[PDB]
Amino acid sequence: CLGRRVVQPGMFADYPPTKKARVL
Amino acid sequence: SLEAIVQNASSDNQGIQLSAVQAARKLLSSDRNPPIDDLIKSGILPILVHCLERDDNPSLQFEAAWALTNIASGTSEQTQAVVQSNAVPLFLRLLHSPHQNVCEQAVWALGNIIGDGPQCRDYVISLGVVKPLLSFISPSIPITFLRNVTWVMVNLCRHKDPPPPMETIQEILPALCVLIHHTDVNILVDTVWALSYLTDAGNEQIQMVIDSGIVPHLVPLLSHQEVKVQTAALRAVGNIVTGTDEQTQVVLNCDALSHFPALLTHPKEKINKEAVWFLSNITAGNQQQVQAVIDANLVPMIIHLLDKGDFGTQKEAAWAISNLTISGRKDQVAYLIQQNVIPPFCNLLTVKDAQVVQVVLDGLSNILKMAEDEAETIGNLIEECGGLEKIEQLQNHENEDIYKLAYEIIDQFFSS
């Protein structure tokens, strides 16, 4: 099962949020 | 109360409406736990969407847009209630509002909707969001607004079942090519993350990103001062090198590997791990790609991490070593041996992750098969560090692909 691999679980966990509230 | 607010919001008189909608907005924006469900159950949503039509009262359109933004910022059920109230076509209209605050809040609300998932994204795309959104990108746009535009672009690019339509990708890539030269950190983080979502979408999407010309602008961001930019770039280029050897070579031709000593030695273990994952996809390539890693002086650093890195990084380094054996030449594998790969590699033979054990046994088998005459020297190195006893024990492993290979290795290389 050697060879290239897609990005693994848990990597790059600081992704931009999908949703954001405007808070005051 | 909510009853009162709904009653006033339904009035025909736009000033009573404005009072009520501002009260709802303040309920929804004054803390980080707004009463979203209570406002949905009150019946205010179709009323707020109706307020969006009132071009004669832009303050009312703004307040309604901000309220709906925050309802849509919640769970998928909350976002979908907004979509089911016909908010999307009315927000798309407000992208052309002459009032800056209304237009910006419409962009923000649409971002939350698009971010809910691929089908929602594809509905908004089908109604024509992309062209007017990218039209905002100009020298005069305020930076806070541009940051929100680029965030929406991330949400247009993300989610994979399905990925966004090809025509949308073709429209977004020229805008990303512009934004990648920006100096603002938040714009760069989002731009690179958007790219990383495209490069994870499949080999045809990788090829579209390559054909845009953007990869030479992306690679040097591996050395950006902001760690958020560096790691976004590592994801974006990392996804490209999951593709074909030719696609990988586009990244190597930008001298990407010269950026890696500072990622392999980075204090953050997560960055070490991500960097070694990238390198493992390089060493899975052809002989010239294997040689690029050798010539960048990275093998000793990989082997150091194989021995002394955190376990998550060690697992990635095991893949980088075994993958080298796929197409590597006898002399490239011999270099690994000279660099003392064998003891830390064999130390992974005993872990509970069967996938890692298999990777290591596959690499050891390939190493032994490749050393036509030196198989005895290498076998002695495996014996010396306890690697042979560990292989013997794997004859008793649960997993058939592991224990079969352990028997075969011992029969082929240690049965003389």
Numbering used by the authors:
A (entry chain B): 419 to 442
B (entry chain A): 72 to 487
Extract from the study:
Active transport of proteins from the cytoplasm to the nucleus is mediated by a family of nuclear transport receptors known as importins (or karyopherins), together with a number of ancillary proteins including nucleoporins and Ran1–3. The W proteins of henipaviruses share a common N-terminal domain with P and V proteins, but have a unique NLS bearing C-terminal domain that is recognised preferentially by importins α3 and α4 (KPNA4 and KPNA3), rather than the better characterised importin α1 (KPNA2).
However, there were marked differences residing outside this region, with importin α3 ARM repeats 6–9 binding HeV W and NiV W residues 419–444 and 421–446, respectively. To gain insights into the basis of isoform specificity, we superimposed the structures of importin α1:HeV W and importin α3:HeV W, and found the structures to be highly similar, with an r.m.s.d. of 1.1 Å across 411 residues, except for the positioning of ARM repeats 7 and 8. Notably, in importin α1, ARM repeats 7 and 8 are positioned closer to the inner surface of the NLS-binding interface, whereas in importin α3, these regions are positioned in a more open conformation. To probe the interaction of the importin α3:HeV W interface in greater detail, we designed mutations to disrupt key salt bridges at the major and minor sites of importin α3. Consistent with these results, we found that mutations in both the major and minor site-binding regions of HeV W disrupted the affinity of interaction to importin α3 in ELISA, and resulted in reduced nuclear accumulation.
